[PDB]
Design a protein around this nucleic acid. Sequence first.
DNA 1: AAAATGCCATCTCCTAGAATCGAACCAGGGTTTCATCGGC
DNA 2: GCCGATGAAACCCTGGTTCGATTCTAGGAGATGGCATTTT
Lengths: 588, 549, 536
Amino acid sequence: MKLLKDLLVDRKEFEDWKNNLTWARDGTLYLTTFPDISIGQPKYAKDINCNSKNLFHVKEFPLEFENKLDFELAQQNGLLNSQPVCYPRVCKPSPIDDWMAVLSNNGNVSVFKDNKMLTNLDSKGNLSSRTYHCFEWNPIESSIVVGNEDGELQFFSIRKNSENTPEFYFESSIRLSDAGSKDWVTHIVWYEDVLVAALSNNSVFSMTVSASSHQPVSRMIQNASRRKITDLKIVDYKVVLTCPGYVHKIDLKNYSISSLKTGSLENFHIIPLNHEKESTILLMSNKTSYKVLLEDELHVTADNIIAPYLEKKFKKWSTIWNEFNNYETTLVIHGISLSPDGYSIAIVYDMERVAFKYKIASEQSFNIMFAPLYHTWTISERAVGLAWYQTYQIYNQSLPKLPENFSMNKKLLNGNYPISLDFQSYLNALMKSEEMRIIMFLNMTIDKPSILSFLEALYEYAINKKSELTNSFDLACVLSIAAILKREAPIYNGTLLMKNSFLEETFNLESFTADPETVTSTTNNTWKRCGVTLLPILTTHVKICPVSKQRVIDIKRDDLNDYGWFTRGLLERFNEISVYCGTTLEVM
Amino acid sequence: MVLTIYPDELVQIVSDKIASNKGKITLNQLWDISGKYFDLSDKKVKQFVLSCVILKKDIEVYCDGAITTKNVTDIIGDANHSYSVGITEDSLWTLLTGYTKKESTIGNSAFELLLEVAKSGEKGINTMDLAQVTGQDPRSVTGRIKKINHLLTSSQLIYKGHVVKQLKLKKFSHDGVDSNPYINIRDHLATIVEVVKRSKNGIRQIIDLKRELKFDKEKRLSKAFIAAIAWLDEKEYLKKVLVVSPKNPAIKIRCVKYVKDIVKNEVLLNRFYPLQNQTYDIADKSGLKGISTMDVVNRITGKEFQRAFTKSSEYYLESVDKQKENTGGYRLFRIYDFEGKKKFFRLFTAQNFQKLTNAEDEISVPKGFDELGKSRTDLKTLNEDNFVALNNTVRFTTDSDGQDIFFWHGELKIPPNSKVVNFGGFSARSLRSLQRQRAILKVMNTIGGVAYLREQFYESVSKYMGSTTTLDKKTVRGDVDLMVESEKLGARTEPVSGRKIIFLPTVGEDAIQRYILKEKDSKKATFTDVIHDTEIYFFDQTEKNRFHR
Amino acid sequence: STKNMKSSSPGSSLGQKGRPIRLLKDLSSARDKIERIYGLNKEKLLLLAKVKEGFETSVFDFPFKNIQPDSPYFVCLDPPCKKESAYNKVIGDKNRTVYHEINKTEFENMIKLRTKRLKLLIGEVDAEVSTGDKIEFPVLANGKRRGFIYNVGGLVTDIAWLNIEENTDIGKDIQYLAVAVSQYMDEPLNEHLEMFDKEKHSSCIQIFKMNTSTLHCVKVQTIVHSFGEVWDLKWHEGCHAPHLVGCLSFVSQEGTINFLEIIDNATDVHVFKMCEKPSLTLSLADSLITTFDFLSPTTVVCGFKNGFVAEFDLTDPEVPSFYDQVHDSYILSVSTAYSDFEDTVVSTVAVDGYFYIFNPKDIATTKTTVSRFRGSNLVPVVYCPQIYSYIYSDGASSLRAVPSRAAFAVHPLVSRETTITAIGVSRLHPMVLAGSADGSLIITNAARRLLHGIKNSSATQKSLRLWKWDYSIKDDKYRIDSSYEVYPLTVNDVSKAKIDAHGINITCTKWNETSAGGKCYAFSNSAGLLTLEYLS
DNA sequence: AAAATGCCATCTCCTAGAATCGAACCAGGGTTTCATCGGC
DNA sequence: GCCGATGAAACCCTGGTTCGATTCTAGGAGATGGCATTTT
């Protein structure tokens, strides 16, 4: 496969040399640059010209930090509040939900949806208990764990307030460190039901975490050691960790340790190859990479996946900047992330001479490279929307594997419509169907997106409860859907009155059968239709699908129109996510 | 028919016409845009259309240029005033660049160019008119275009006799082939040589090759092809020859003949001495020559520390204008010098600089000591006399048990216990200017004290300087003006040619008139080598006929 | 950008007021300033009360009594290398330093110290001082001064006192000084002094035995070695054994940290020794160590040419505990801030101009920026433990203090006419020696700058020129000016750099850090004139 | 009532990043000179 | 065959382009003084 051209990012700095890249569920890149986070905002184009500049728009993503500790005096960690203006150190997006969490330089973990802080995580206790150095999202359910300077894990769970906004509340804690110890929690990895954490003394603990347990038993799986843990990962219930000169595998069924000695003291990042049959990782440093098989004894093989591309790039750079080998030169990695589906890897890098050096921000540049890890891919439920499209462009527009004889003629839930459900449960059952993910992806591959399979699933919920379509907006919607599907409609004759703040437009209900893009009012004014409900857009208060360019009525900015249970249910359920492609809607 | 669009699509279309009109439009232009898409005859639709546009956060409305209170029903009814619609600067930056003014890496000057390129629309603007319309220096305009070129499409054009770039916003890129694709003869030299190389005897009739490569299509391409053959002859990739016809020896034609086809860096920086002393040491070891800031950086730190070195060396290097206080002993002077186009500082130790600027003056007496300090107070007296009391704050006391207990002041009752350099007659702004001025005068003594200030003179000075770089007209006339101000040259306009003549003030009028008379009717365009009794390969039967005649 | 919320420490003056503090100017109350910088630990505040009452009046000089253990003001804050007997852990029959004795002819073949006598003018004495001679200070004006100047015979790269109080075979008044000496003198851009790549050549360390009461001084050993130039010269104050003077540690142009056993002579008769193999060498493949400090009697933190930091265990030195990139370029100095009340933290400054403080437990989550400087080859950083502050230069004429917590609270101490090149601090008192490229040595009290309010800083803070070197080009002669000069702390001061004689820049200055010798300090210029003064 | 604390305005210096300016170089077009053709 | 006119080629001129280091400007940081209010 031939790679896309690297995304050149200019005039951005990192404070440090750890892994500063995360790749969100929706395809967003988060780079913990200094002093603000940078987002690679996902973008759709039909042709990207094999250039990744067309998949991402990279911009400054400024955030407001509330320091819950700025009236606390520092105690044993003298570097707390040593620089009182907060800035982000670590940023992890949720593997499930719309939001991200950010660790500040002063040990606060704050959750954000868009630029807005949801919660600043806190529980009552000593200052060391309230100062955080790592966090991890629950991979299965909406919860987050933080690690503090007491060497305990604190678990926080979401609950939703009157506005259906989430609130994080302290659930429970587990102490890992010895009583009166000063060891901090430095790493946390949560994989399925298994949670692994490392202390600043480089002891490692495992736990099994569940809804069925309030405080699970921890087990120490590696004793304390001077060798600082570099990276920690879980692969098929095997803990893999790297430290100077070594990689260790801990089997979480046998608690056996096997270890392998690296030929280098550079930091190795661990890249789990989750979709191989055999249990494997890539190890990657600034200098080398390897493919390790997590057998009973760790076996080393050549990295035939990523090394060839970085070698080829470094040889071109060396031709321009290190003719005659007059300089010592290095690749520098600033971040490595798997894609949310795990099929692709993103590497943010630059290439440097070892030299006396004094850069300013305007002189900074780095490249992010995207490469496929496998020969084939699938439409993962760990990814949404433009994430699938990114994984399609990587892999050189090769389609994913699909079910046998699949076609966009296929009905959602194979026509086993759960009509007995409440309408929000019903819409959730459709949107979680396997056929819907496939159709939403294929809509990004074809010239004109289509939702005929979804409109049938709505029509079957509308000829059932046919007696409850009393409302004029709901009738105009179902009559439009019936006209698209070419079927019987509940009533033909009557009127819809629809309003904005300046202009009131009356439509004959009969006119909703005439044209699929437009509808003409009794004044002969002609109006575009809403993508989701097929009602006329009389307003700029709309959200735009970034792929299909369909406009959706924004139910949250229309107080004037008396939308019934059906049209309101659709416009409430599809206020944020495109029914066409699963992409987040853009806001006008 | 009235086109149907979304109301938000209208607001984008209006915004993309406020951008591309330098950030503002009249209200009548908004009716011309929106009248294409909405029936403005209905007062309620006209109010709705204006509301879509002006209730957007980043749109401003002005009444007679003054920002006004967005009363839609007033603005549409009010005939008494002129209304206009603009946008916030960050909206204007976002529409044109995709980033706000703060975040965009483009720069104000490149954004003034992008605003004029955007206002030009599908017609576009050429780089020469773009410079004149914005009033930006042509020396900077094309460097600024490089930083916005990702937002543009461009093609080469000839305008007022110069090759220029036509510029448009990238949305006006056309996939169709150009009607007038710009051809430069200098791109085809390899083809011209290869066609001569592959010709039967390695020779072509020049007019025949001009016709075969179809460069006869334009007087420009005719001149350009001839200049390319002349350049390939001058650089001896080809050679011009005259071929006498073997069929009629009275007939000669101008021909061209084939000739040929076209372990470590060590940095000396140490941690033991201040950087200014390390800089002084190689400036001193360079001697009367001086050393460039480029060589100082390469030898001490390497190129990646150039900026840090420059910011540090500003504190201890002295320009000849605005010198620092005369410490004596150790001083580094800096002056401009040139390496072709690059202007950089050479560094000189003050001894070597004095020998350079004032070569006739006495070499300076070496400095001894300064006077000693004349204070005789002892450390005890100074310690007692310079005490100022601190703030009270932290305190302690010893208990009767002998335990020391901490307290803050006031929390126990316990009371307190407490610009042209002279160079000996040649005024110059750089060492290259000084070298050029002395080279001009030395050539003028050599070639007989009078010269027309033409290209033949600029080569004579370039040769005497040993310069591989060739002197520009504007450079030599710059030095000649300095040498006239210092009365080392005379110069005047020659009445008939209008060329500037320079002459040594020691050279008489009779010599200047005889020089003009000797230069008049000086023969040029002289004939090339001759060839006989041999065939020419011809593309054109009319050229073959003229050779056969 | 940022906002506060009301959760607050008990007993805090800051907590009672509720004012959000972002800059040093916000700490307009003297109790709030001390409380924000040092915290509320009563045992820590008791030590600062003892430093305050014991040294508030000591603007340029301090009484000898306040550094004796029987004083109520005695605060001796031993460095982390001293906290245990390391010798049997770090050294033993597996790790003895190997020497052979050489004669003066073999020494002179390997190391060409200066043969031409230096012309020295001091007070009214004009003298030619030969290599290895000293001149005692004459009857100067401005009071009797006790001390001497020694002509070491080469470029003095570093010096180090051995801070023993007493030993079974070292009586109270005796002290040892190690002096590192280069033969590549008189040439500021000599090829062999390069910073950036591995260089090996013969240099020497001279060991001096000095009596603090008589100022009798004897060079007892010269160690010839092939490590190149050496700096961060430190005695491992934890490695003591009956047969040693002590264990001496340094980084070298070889790019390694080396530990020598300095084996005590039978007699003060001078011996020359060739160091064949040190007791311990710390190194990595394909990077050079450029600076180090102790974290522990058995662990060191070190900086590299490539901008990495490592920790080494001195009991298992082959592989470092961590090896992380911290800077973009060559690390100039690394310095350990130690406290009985806070986790140990490490500061680093590099050629890229950044000054960082981090905790080696977790560099990623603790790395704090103090400031960016203008970019420089020479940025001295030392930890002054009595005020829990790093004392450092810009690399450009300003001397500053920053507390190891509250990196925002930078205090300027004094501004010079030129590059500051050396800083000296003591565990026993808050007095700072700073040496400069113009050959001036100043003294200032850093606990009058910290432990005081923000208002009227320029009126309360002063420094004194103890000495100035001058060089006469006409005479080829060095002069040392004894006359004292008072400098107030300057306001809005322009950064200054000037070029002075290559010989007069002060390369190093170190206090003796013992109760018996604690008023002695030594300083050297590049010419190799080592001056000791017993300040009294 | 006096000293301390808090905040604002003004002044001075620094640093980053953008803008300037000289010189060379290059191409096109005008001008000038030379050669050839045609007319006497 | 010679002389005059035209056309054709060569040479010179003018302005834009190109490039990079140094210079300049904008924005921020830090300190003091003054004034007012609070605390001792």
